[PDB]
Design a protein around this ligand. Structure first.
Ligand SMILES: C[C@@H](O)[C@@H](C(=O)O)[C@H]1CC(SCCNC=N)=C(C(=O)O)N1
Ligand SMILES: [Zn+2]
Ligand SMILES: [Zn+2]
Length: 219
């Protein structure tokens, strides 16, 4: 499978794309972000593997950046697979307390730092972490970049098919989608884990898909 790809979105915002075969889903394409604050870099989700996480870190280190911190949007491996490697390099990893306990219960390595707040400033006025409510998972988070007006929706944004429902809360997802739409209507760009980037309407598409999946789940 190809190496991690890095693509600039605009000044200070990069998309990282990694590929992994996962048991019954075939090769998964996963998008995360790298956000620059001056000469500091922040990883928004880890790629699937230690190897891709190392390639990503080394790419920004070679371009003169310090990796100040990572945030995992939820406990699944497409958001957290790099945490063990980052910890071994003493790069600060962050997850919600709920995410870290879901990781523990799954026998996975935890982020070194956790937080319980619904709205958490990873970097004050630069990187906000928000819990809209359950959807894709009980713990899923989004990341908001107030300066660029970019929203990273992770595996919660699902405009054309909900994907893995194993850990999903179909009852809550529509309500959580409305909360997200209410908070981030002013997003100029929505980046998701597995879909094409788009405008704020991807939040409304997610609301519609969640309702459609909830109606389906009731034979
Ligand atoms: C591999 C694991 O992280 C998994 C998950 O988080 O549930 C991946 C694989 C999947 S299915 C791949 C994409 N299919 C439809 N969007 C999803 C997802 O549904 O968000 N994420
Ligand atoms: Zn997931
Ligand atoms: Zn996913």
């Amino acid at each position: 499978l190809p190496d991690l790809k890095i693509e600039k979105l605009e000044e200070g915002v990069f998309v990282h794309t990694s590929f992994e075969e996962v048991n019954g889903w075939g090769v998964v394409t996963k998008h995360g972000l790298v956000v620059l604050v001056n000469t500091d870099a922040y990883l928004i989700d880890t790629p699937f593997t230690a190897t891709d996480t190392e390639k990503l870190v080394n790419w920004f280190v070679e371009r003169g950046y310090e990796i100040k911190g990572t945030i995992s949007s939820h406990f699944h491996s497409d958001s957290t697979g790099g945490i063990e490697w980052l910890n071994s390099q003493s790069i600060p990893t962050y997850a919600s307390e709920l995410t870290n306990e879901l990781l523990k219960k799954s026998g996975k390595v935890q982020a070194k730092y956790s937080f319980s707040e619904v709205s958490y400033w990873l970097v004050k006025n630069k990187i906000e972490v928000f819990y809209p409510g359950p959807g894709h998972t009980q713990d899923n988070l989004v990341v908001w970049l107030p300066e660029s007006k970019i929203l990273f929706g992770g595996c919660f944004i699902k405009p054309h098919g909900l994907g893995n429902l194993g850990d999903a809360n179909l009852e809550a997802w529509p309500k959580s989608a409305k909360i997200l739409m209410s908070k981030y209507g002013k997003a100029k760009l929505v980046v998701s884990s597995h879909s094409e980037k788009g405008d704020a309407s991807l939040m409304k598409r997610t609301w519609e898909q969640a309702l459609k999946g909830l109606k389906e789940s009731k034979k």
